[PDB]
Scaffold this active site. Structure first.
Site, PDB file in Angstrom:
ATOM      1  N   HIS A   1     -11.402 -20.925 -19.787  1.00 21.95           N
ATOM      2  CA  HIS A   1      -9.641 -20.549 -20.572  1.00 21.95           C
ATOM      3  C   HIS A   1      -9.095 -20.418 -18.681  1.00 21.95           C
ATOM      4  CE1 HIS A   1      -6.460 -18.967 -22.202  1.00 21.95           C
ATOM      5  NE2 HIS A   1      -6.546 -19.857 -22.575  1.00 21.95           N
ATOM      6  N   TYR A   2      -7.307 -20.988 -18.877  1.00 25.46           N
ATOM      7  CA  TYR A   2      -6.678 -21.077 -18.123  1.00 25.46           C
ATOM      8  C   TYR A   2      -6.508 -20.039 -17.650  1.00 25.46           C
ATOM      9  CZ  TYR A   2      -2.858 -20.076 -21.308  1.00 25.46           C
ATOM     10  OH  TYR A   2      -2.308 -20.259 -22.538  1.00 25.46           O
ATOM     11  N   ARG A   3      -7.040 -18.604 -18.393  1.00 25.15           N
ATOM     12  CA  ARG A   3      -6.517 -17.157 -18.030  1.00 25.15           C
ATOM     13  C   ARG A   3      -7.378 -16.840 -16.768  1.00 25.15           C
ATOM     14  NH1 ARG A   3      -2.797 -15.987 -20.521  1.00 25.15           N
ATOM     15  NH2 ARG A   3      -3.663 -15.939 -22.522  1.00 25.15           N
TER      16      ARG A   3
ATOM     17  N   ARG B   1     -11.470 -19.375  -8.489  1.00 26.24           N
ATOM     18  CA  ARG B   1     -10.889 -20.288  -8.858  1.00 26.24           C
ATOM     19  C   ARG B   1     -10.175 -21.407  -7.968  1.00 26.24           C
ATOM     20  NH1 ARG B   1      -9.049 -21.252 -14.129  1.00 26.24           N
ATOM     21  NH2 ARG B   1      -8.877 -19.506 -14.920  1.00 26.24           N
TER      22      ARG B   1
END
Lengths: 177, 176
Positions: free
Chosen positions: A127-129, A112
């Site tokens: 998604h931020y997950r 990421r």
């Protein structure tokens, strides 16, 4: 075709460990459903980089990317970072809507961070997950060492398939469903 | 008392979420054994920052750290970033060997980003892996929602909540 519960699996190769000083040289993706069934395999892309970046890699990266064939594929690639990002987004858009899936894989914090610097349009699609299979690998090593031992790739899609298989293994033998 | 199976739990406060723009202003650590029993609570350190950095915060951070008292603690603090890093490392070395424990907690990729930039020797003291409880929360949300639904503002309570969250998943989501 898009399903907000589908999962994006990604793996990168880089010229070094620093997301801001090094660069991406390979990417691949696989899409599964939420129960880890493979829906589609994405493109494997070698990303062109100048010779001085290849020459600048440390001894380990020079040997590993040399003998896997990636260094030569990077030299011969006519695909820029931005073109690889766009090619991967065109694949993922068919299967997952924006901001729905976590980034999935082993130690995908590193991936990421490289995407955030070098492919921010693709990073922003997740998604931020984070779904980090290596979190479960660490817990199994400490709490159920036998589940680890009951489970050596180099090709990009083999690596992602093994990450998916590793999570399937934990879902089956480590997690109380 | 060093043991390579002990786990290092960390919590950071920052002026904002961008390591190029922002800095660490609070840190705290807890060491557990591999089965989540607290071995020792580390120091909670407010890290001094000059006034221009404190005035450069956005609206949410100015208000959250102001109302919590952290801003004033930071203003008064006489501990630099490097000194806080050293103080935390001096504590951790008594319990955990180098490169043995992952970073443990919640949303710890952002923690690793800030350590890598601002406290690189502490960042290098961890194993490169993350033990992020939110991975379990995501999987429970998908595969056992009732375990997720079945489950604090100060730093040590924050870390203890993450340990308890992991314990909850170990007791009701992991089969051992």
């Amino acid at each position: 075709m898009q399903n907000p519960q589908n999962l994006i699996w990604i793996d990168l190769e880089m010229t070094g460990l620093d997301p801001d000083r090094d660069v991406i040289i390979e990417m691949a993706t696989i899409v599964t459903d939420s129960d880890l069934n493979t829906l589609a395999e994405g493109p494997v892309i070698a990303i062109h980089q100048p010779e001085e970046i290849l020459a600048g890699m440390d001894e380990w990266n020079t040997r590993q990317h040399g003998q896997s064939g990636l260094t030569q594929r990077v030299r011969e690639s006519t695909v820029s970072m931005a073109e690889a990002e766009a090619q991967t987004l065109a694949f993922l858009e068919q299967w997952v809507p924006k901001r729905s899936s976590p980034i999935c894989g082993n130690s995908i914090c590193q991936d990421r961070r490289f995407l955030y610097r070098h492919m921010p349009r693709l990073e922003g699609y997740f998604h931020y997950r984070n779904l980090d299979v290596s979190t479960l690998k660490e817990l199994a090593a400490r709490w159920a060492p036998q589940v680890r031992e009951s489970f050596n790739t180099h090709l990009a899609l083999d690596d992602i398939r093994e990450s998916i298989a590793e999570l399937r293994h934990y879902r089956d033998h480590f997690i109380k469903l």
